């Protein structure tokens, strides 16, 4: 235990994760984003969905 990162982490990572369109790096790019802001670590994967559908990289 440290802070409540990991936990909104592991919801937001498990939810960017799963985004089938973004690649890796969109993918990850999202992991970064939830430690530069677990607060909007919520925000991120609305903003990856928004990503995954926006990008839906064939």
Same mark, same amino acid.
């Given at each position: #235990?440290? $802070?409540? *990162? $990991?936990?909104? %982490? #592991?919801? !937001? /990572?498990?939810? /960017?994760?799963? &985004?089938? @369109?973004? @690649?890796?790096?969109? #993918? #990850?790019? *999202? /992991? $970064?984003? &939830? %430690? =530069? =802001? ?12 928004? &990503? @995954?559908?926006?990008? !839906?990289?064939?």
């Amino acid at each position: #235990v440290d $802070n409540k *990162f $990991n936990k909104e %982490r #592991v919801i !937001a /990572i498990g939810e /960017i994760m799963r &985004l089938p @369109n973004l @690649n890796s790096l969109q #993918v #990850v790019a *999202f /992991i $970064n984003s &939830l %430690r =530069d =802001d677990p607060s909007q670590s919520a925000n991120l994967l609305a903003e990856a969905k928004k &990503l @995954n559908d926006a990008q !839906a990289p064939k």
